Scaffold this active site. Structure first.
Site: not given
Ligand code: NA
Ligand code: NA
Ligand code: NA
Ligand code: NA
Ligand code: NA
Ligand code: NA
Ligand code: NA
Ligand code: NA
Ligand code: NA
Ligand code: NA
Ligand code: NA
Ligand code: NA
Ligand code: NA
Ligand code: NA
Ligand code: NA
Ligand code: NA
Ligand code: NA
Ligand code: NA
Ligand code: NA
Ligand code: NA
Ligand code: NA
Ligand code: NA
Length: 441
Positions: A74, A292, A290, A347, A118, A163
């Site tokens: 990607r 995290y 995405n 991600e 992006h 995002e």
């Molecule tokens: Na992280």
């Protein structure tokens, strides 16, 4: 615990974060070129002027991808390489770079996934209003048309936006990211135009109907948990979820904005033209996720009645909570709420303070631990009915982490920014094994 045959294991980057060559080959200035010239905006006064020098070093990086056995890669396309200026004329050198990259990917049996936007908006578009202007949706669609006409049959997976929530919040609410506006009242307007640009871009894609190609959008999410079982905290968590996680999903899938969004942005309806929700909600082929870290929320007496509670441990170098169950919960929640649509995790990864040892090896067991937990959680989601089609580690390379500059390393490959030397980290070696095994252990 094997993943499905054909599961797409990848790694991800973005153009401003890795390419360098910021003023070469007729490339125009982006809002990030401009933003990084502003004193005090970026840690250590860093910029993407050189970054990983990937524009020049892409063949080396292609071989590194091959060494890992990646099934897919990607990247994002630098719009300012393609349309440098307000003439809207196509820069052929810029386009040729992506042609060469994509050819190289196919040569090594790596499936391209291209992100059209992006965050590196051409300054000429910003001069014409940027995302505040409805017309930027049309500019974005003309850009998409050019790229899909040029490379559609060669790029099987396209993402319109990366995002859009971050663009809204960091770019317009907080002024922390380009273009650096600090007016919360603008968020709805911006969100609508980002969504409209996605819709018009998707229309351009459907018109071209490239053979074997699919198009979606990438959204970021933070799984929301209340800090207690108290009704007030549960309510705050529900409201925060609607806003943080469904601001974009609701209009994309259901063709309406949710109540949390309309309350946050009470002038949003003024920007909605009669067609606009139909265009925005036309079917996507897949969703890019995405993720995290989760967010933990409590009720507050003071406006807006929600407080995010910070976590001290366990965290990454960004101070982001490590909670792999957050990924499982997110994927299940999306699937239950919006249906079993195709999902790629576009991600997932972690920043830790990596240092080469005396022998020159970079051993990052904390990052291995992060991927172990999160890939495990993704596998459970798949077992429990999520249509997970692929997983992209952020990032292939240590890179320019926006306002943090080079102080944060997300790579599975270590980059010495003084010499441009690349070294596979322990996590890259571990990931190669996961790909070869098609799963953990
Ligand atoms: Na992280
Ligand atoms: Na660049
Ligand atoms: Na500076
Ligand atoms: Na400073
Ligand atoms: Na610099
Ligand atoms: Na390979
Ligand atoms: Na080729
Ligand atoms: Na080929
Ligand atoms: Na201009
Ligand atoms: Na406008
Ligand atoms: Na415009
Ligand atoms: Na154009
Ligand atoms: Na169309
Ligand atoms: Na059409
Ligand atoms: Na209450
Ligand atoms: Na937020
Ligand atoms: Na439609
Ligand atoms: Na992190
Ligand atoms: Na660390
Ligand atoms: Na940052
Ligand atoms: Na820095
Ligand atoms: Na550097």
């Amino acid at each position: 615990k094997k993943f499905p045959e054909g599961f797409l294991w990848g790694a991800a980057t973005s153009s401003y974060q890795i390419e360098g060559a910021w003023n070469e080959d007729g490339k125009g200035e982006s809002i990030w070129d401009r933003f990084t010239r502003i004193p005090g905006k970026i840690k250590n006064g860093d910029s993407g002027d050189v970054a990983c020098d990937h524009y020049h070093r892409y063949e080396q990086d292609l071989d590194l991808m091959r060494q890992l056995g990646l099934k897919t890669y990607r990247f994002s396309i630098a719009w300012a390489r393609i349309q440098p200026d307000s003439s809207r004329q196509i820069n052929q050198r810029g386009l040729d770079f992506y042609r060469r990259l994509v050819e190289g990917l196919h040569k090594r049996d790596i499936l391209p996934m291209a992100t059209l936007y992006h965050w590196d908006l051409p300054q000429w578009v910003e001069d014409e209003g940027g995302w505040l202007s409805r017309e930027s949706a049309s500019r974005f669609a003309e850009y998409t048309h050019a790229l899909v006409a040029a490379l559609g049959d060669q790029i099987p997976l396209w993402v319109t936006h990366n995002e859009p929530m971050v663009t809204v919040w960091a770019g317009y609410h907080m002024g922390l990211f380009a273009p650096g506006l600090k007016d919360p009242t603008l968020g709805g307007r911006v969100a609508h135009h980002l969504l409209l640009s996605h819709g018009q871009a998707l229309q351009a894609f459907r018109a071209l109907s490239p053979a074997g190609s699919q198009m979606g959008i990438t959204l970021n999410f933070n799984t929301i948990y209340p800090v207690s079982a108290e009704p007030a905290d549960v309510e705050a968590a529900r409201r925060m979820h609607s806003f943080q996680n469904e601001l974009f999903l609701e209009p994309l899938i259901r063709g309406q904005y949710n109540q949390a969004t309309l309350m946050a942005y009470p002038n949003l309806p003024e920007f909605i033209a009669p067609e606009d929700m139909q265009t925005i909600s036309a079917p996507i082929d897949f969703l890019g996720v995405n993720y995290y870290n989760p967010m933990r929320v409590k009720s507050s007496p003071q406006p807006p009645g929600i407080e995010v509670v910070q976590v001290e441990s366990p965290v990454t170098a960004m101070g982001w909570e490590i909670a792999p169950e957050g990924l499982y919960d997110l994927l299940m929640g999306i699937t239950r709420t919006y249906g079993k649509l195709p999902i790629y995790i576009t991600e997932n990864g972690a920043a830790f303070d990596d240092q080469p040892d005396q022998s020159g090896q970079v051993n990052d067991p904390q990052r291995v631990g992060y991927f172990q937990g999160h890939i495990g959680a993704a596998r459970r989601a798949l077992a429990d009915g999520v249509d997970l089609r692929g997983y992209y580690a952020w990032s292939l390379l240590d890179n320019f982490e926006w306002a943090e500059g080079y102080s944060k390393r997300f790579g599975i490959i270590y980059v010495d920014f003084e010499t441009q030397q690349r070294t596979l980290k322990q996590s890259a070696q571990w990931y190669r094994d996961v790909i070869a095994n098609n799963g953990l252990e």
